[PDB]
Write a protein that binds this DNA or RNA. Structure first.
Lengths: 129, 402, 62
RNA sequence: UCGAUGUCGGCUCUUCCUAUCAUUGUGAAGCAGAAUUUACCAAGCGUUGGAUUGUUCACCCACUAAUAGGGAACGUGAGCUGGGUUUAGACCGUCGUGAGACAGGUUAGUUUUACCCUACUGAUGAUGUGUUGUUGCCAUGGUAAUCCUGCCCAGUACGAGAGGAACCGCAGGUUCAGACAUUUGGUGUAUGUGCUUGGCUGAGGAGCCAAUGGGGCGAAGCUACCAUCUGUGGGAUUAUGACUGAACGCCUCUAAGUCAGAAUCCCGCCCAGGCGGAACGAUACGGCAGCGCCGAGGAGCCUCGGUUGGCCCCGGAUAGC
RNA sequence: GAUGAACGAGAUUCCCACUGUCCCUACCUACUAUCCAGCGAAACCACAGCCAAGGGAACGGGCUUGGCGGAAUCAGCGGG
RNA sequence: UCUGGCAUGUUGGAACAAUGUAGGUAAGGGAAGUCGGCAAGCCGGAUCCGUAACUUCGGGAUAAGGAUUGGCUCUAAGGG
RNA sequence: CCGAUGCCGACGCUCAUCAGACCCCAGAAAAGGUGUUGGUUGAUAUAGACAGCAGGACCUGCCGAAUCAACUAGCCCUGA
RNA sequence: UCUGGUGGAGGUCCGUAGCGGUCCUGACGUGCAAAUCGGUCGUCCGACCUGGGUAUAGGGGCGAAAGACUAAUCGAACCA
């Protein structure tokens, strides 16, 4: 089971797209698993499923809602064994509902939290940080 | 009309009076239920909060992602020098409740315990218990004591011990001992009284009350924070920037028709210094305290069976806003109430411990001892001297000596 | 229980201290504190900062 | 109610109702499983983030266990806001000869006062026990936890197939609550230590001024689901399903008499602690005194009043004693 | 009537940049508020001031019936 | 900062609570707040490059976008 | 409470896990109950009633005296 | 015709003093003030700002026009 992680990406955040589908942006519009509370924005961290829209990218996937998974984040979070880790940028990849990647390759590192939750994403990762 | 969108209320009315606690020492409001089949034992103890540090251990819960993996856990150190038994209290059960039947005190009571009986010890003549003690010596008084133990034997259902902490051994400005009643559980009332009588005037170490990897309750008073607004006291939503006459307040404090402010509305007032009882705190370690053996002082507190560093639980430079810890201590997982130096009440659990988390046996691999007075990076002074090398102050001392 | 070395100061990092920094190009760095972390993010050269291990090794101070 | 009860909506916050969306426990189906529908106890708990609109309403996007409906002077303006409506400026259309009208559109347009009483939040205190202190008990009031994933059960039961559960158990998370800084982050006038602009002390050294000159890194402290820790047991029972069993020679959960039974209820755990008690300790300078016990021994005085023999005791049953 | 460069403390929509507007609040500074010495007002005031229901000029502090009620005060507060 | 002028603007002492007035800072997001980017923030000087649509040919224009900028030691040119 | 039944008052009815409790007056209807109590009408039963024990398939034998149906109206209950 | 200079026009632009008064619907709102204060703003060679002296007086004046102003008084001032 996945332990709780410091969330850094609320609704409205634009993150890089690390796959090779042609999308360059992911604009987060919602997060799975979020019941929510009054006035509280849904927020996502590494390993979380989100609905995003492509703001810059190839036209055939620009004006739609896509599933995506966050693989890197700038907000430092505490792994057990007391390690605070953050990345240089926020990133995600476009996937389907079952978790399979729409792309075939991932640029840059992938957090260990998202790799363990999503084996298909991990198999496309060059490195795990 | 109805609230447009539902939201749970801010705060809990289970801590409603939200005032300064009438007591500085934590109070046991319910002792563990007595079981006569169990051996005679104590149920509570008094310690002092020295500070916090973090440990490293490997966990043993099979289905977890951290199973057989090394984790870092925050802990709190509670210095617990032995307590001295000075009295016995008997209670009888009545249809109006538990009533104090008779209390008996020991012959010699130390000056630190007598200090609790005075508001100005400096001006006092120290006459407390000077006539009571003579009863332990006189033959007529001795008979009355025996009769008073016998009446307790045949009439009392609850037996407690009056015990106090030794503040000589603590690095605190205060010299006045904390007195407490600790209930005796197990056995019969006769066996409780015999147990109490024989260790009257004696010393009870903390290892005879609590054991390793057991889950205990901590009672104490919360850190004081004075007068506070509803935004900090009750965590209400801040009003917009362009609000007239104040942002940090509750906009509507009630409807028209009940025509009164209800007790359930957040108001500004005292925050902190509240009596609280947290219930599931595991004992990660029971330290041994400094002792002199063969002319050499043993500092080996907080040396695990994986580092053997020959260091003490004391961090480099000492605990901040608290002296050195030289006595027995209890290491608890997590945080506890109170400031530093705050006296804590530790009592046995009222619940039956059966979950895996409560029953698991923990074994520390490392204990952090870096300075808490900054961003400490050296565990011991010897480690720092080896890494740094000779300094100018050492060469100056060598020049002065030679 | 592995102990790391700081990527800027060369100091010994104990388990519950500091932060780890993973770059987009795949390199992972360890920082003892935010003083070392800020100097690294400022592109400062540790060989030019007096209190680093690298500076003392270069200047043969030990 | 017109010698004035501030007015739409939103924001904030509490409590209440149930005509129940979900969750607990059930009954029924055109209930095979999954999903769904109908009904009962039931309001403990929860009922979201956004685009457009001044809007209530509506509609769509997206998560969700669900995104139920309402009240409290169509809750809530000395709590806010002022977008709209509702003054005076101005514009258009239509109407009017005109001044001007519009239940039509548009743009700009002062939101006052609490130090009084109560209510509520905290803070001293009060009467009593001769004084004072320590340790404690409890009346009574408050009260709190909540929901969901994944693994396994199991591709199993069920089903022709397609599909496709559940109890025990394990690992976690949401919402809420109570704390807490070991660690990460924030703050930072320790005005701590470097750097730097303008000026000033003849220059160096050392400093100062620029309402905190600016900037880097910063101890302690405070603080963030932005770090960490903790959150619990019983009783009588509801709906329901039953047992024995008449009424009513059979039958019947009901009539007498029994059983199991829950997010409800009551208590516990937790918070407070009565014009409410308890056990214990010590109880007045030393030469002037006060105080305690011996029902102390009396003699007398003032004051408040009531009353005008006692019963020192089985437990109880009541179609029996 | 239509249009239109330049201009506008005029009304409006979107985009980049930027941000405590917000998620979600926190810490710091000065002046207050605070307490003290000295000085020292005003508005307002039938009497006053704890509630529930009732009836009543149909929304009571007073009346009926219940709940109950303990000197003197301090800092806040905006239900009445 | 000097000449000249003053005593902090009708009082002082102590403390550093809530709320406020005024001034700041803030991790990760970056208008998701709100009627509305209101408020705040970003930009900002000079030098060297480079500047669109449109246009009443005047402008738009500091359009937009980019680089440099300290201290010290020199060199060349510019006069009576 | 609150003056006055502290009558050895009379006959019945009614149990409600929202009982009921007095003119105006301050809350309930249609429709229902094999709760209980009265009442009306019809019918069965010595050749043998109604039950129950079974068979043939409405009849029989075994127990051997009341039973069955419809309706009506009081209190109580559902409707609420 | 093009280029480089010179020149110094403009109810020209940035922006001091001055004149004015956008937004915060900020402060204050029994005020410092019967209209003030701060930040931010408009203009700043002109249809510019300003002193003194003069003229117009109430159904009258004056009005780059708001029923504005005409001594805190204006959809006809003040005094008796």
């Amino acid at each position: 089971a996945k332990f709780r992680i410091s969330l850094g990406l609320p609704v409205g955040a634009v993150i890089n797209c690390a796959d090779n589908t042609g999308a360059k942006n992911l604009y987060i519009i919602s997060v799975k698993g979020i019941k929510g509370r009054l006035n509280r924005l849904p927020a996502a961290g590494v390993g979380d499923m989100v609905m995003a829209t492509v703001k810059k990218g190839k036209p055939e996937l620009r004006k739609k809602v896509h599933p995506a998974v966050v693989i890197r984040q700038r907000k430092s979070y505490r792994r057990k064994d007391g390690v605070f880790l953050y990345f240089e940028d926020n990133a995600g990849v476009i996937v389907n509902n079952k978790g399979e990647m729409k792309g075939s390759a991932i640029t840059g590192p992938v957090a260990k939290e998202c790799a363990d939750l999503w084996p298909r994403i991990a198999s496309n990762a060059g490195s795990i940080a | 009309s109805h609230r447009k969108f539902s939201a749970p209320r801010h705060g809990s009315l289970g801590f409603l009076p939200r005032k300064r606690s009438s007591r500085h020492r934590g109070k046991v409001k319910s002792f563990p239920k007595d079981d006569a089949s169990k051996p005679v034992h104590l149920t509570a103890f008094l310690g002092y909060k020295a500070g916090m540090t973090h440990i490293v251990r490997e966990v043993d819960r099979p289905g977890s992602k951290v199973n057989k993996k090394e984790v870092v856990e925050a802990v709190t150190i509670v210095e617990t020098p032995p307590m001295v038994v000075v009295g016995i209290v008997g209670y009888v059960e009545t249809p109006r409740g538990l009533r104090t039947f008779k209390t008996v005190f020991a012959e010699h009571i130390s000056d630190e315990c007598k200090r609790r009986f005075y508001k100005n010890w400096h001006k006092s003549k120290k006459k407390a218990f000077t006539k009571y003690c003579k009863k332990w010596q006189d033959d007529t008084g001795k008979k009355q004591l025996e009769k008073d133990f016998n009446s307790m034997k045949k009439y009392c259902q609850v037996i407690r011990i009056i015990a106090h902490t030794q503040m000589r051994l603590l690095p605190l400005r205060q010299k006045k001992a904390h007195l407490m009643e600790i209930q005796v559980n197990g056995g019969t009332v006769a066996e409780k009284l015999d147990w109490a009588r024989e260790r009257l005037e004696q010393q009870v170490p903390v290892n005879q009350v609590f054991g390793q990897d057991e889950m205990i309750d901590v009672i104490g008073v919360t850190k004081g924070k004075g007068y506070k607004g509803v935004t900090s006291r009750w965590h209400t939503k801040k009003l917009p920037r362009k609000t007239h006459r104040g942002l940090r307040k509750v906009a509507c404090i009630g409807a028209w028709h009940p025509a009164r402010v209800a007790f359930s509305v957040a108001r500004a007032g005292q925050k902190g210094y509240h009596h609280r009882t947290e219930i599931n705190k595991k004992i990660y370690k029971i330290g041994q305290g400094y002792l002199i053996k063969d002319g050499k002082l043993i500092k080996n507190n907080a040396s695990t069976d994986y580092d053997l560093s020959d260091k003490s639980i004391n961090p480099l430079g000492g605990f901040v806003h608290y002296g050195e810890v030289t006595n027995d201590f209890i290491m608890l997982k997590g945080c506890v109430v109170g400031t530093k130096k705050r006296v804590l009440t530790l009592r046995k659990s009222l619940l039956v411990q059966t979950k895996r988390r409560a029953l698991e046996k923990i074994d520390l691999k490392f204990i952090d001892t870096t300075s808490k007075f900054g961003h400490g990076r050296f565990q011991t002074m010897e480690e720092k001297k080896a890494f740094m090398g000779p300094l100018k102050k050492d060469r100056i001392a060598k020049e002065e000596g030679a | 229980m592995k102990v790391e070395l700081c990527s800027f100061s060369g100091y010994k990092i104990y388990p519950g201290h500091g932060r780890r920094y993973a770059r987009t190009d795949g390199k992972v760095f360890q920082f003892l504190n935010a003083k070392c972390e800020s100097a690294f993010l400022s592109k400062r050269n540790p060989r030019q900062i007096n209190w680093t291990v690298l500076y003392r090794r270069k200047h043969k101070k030990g």
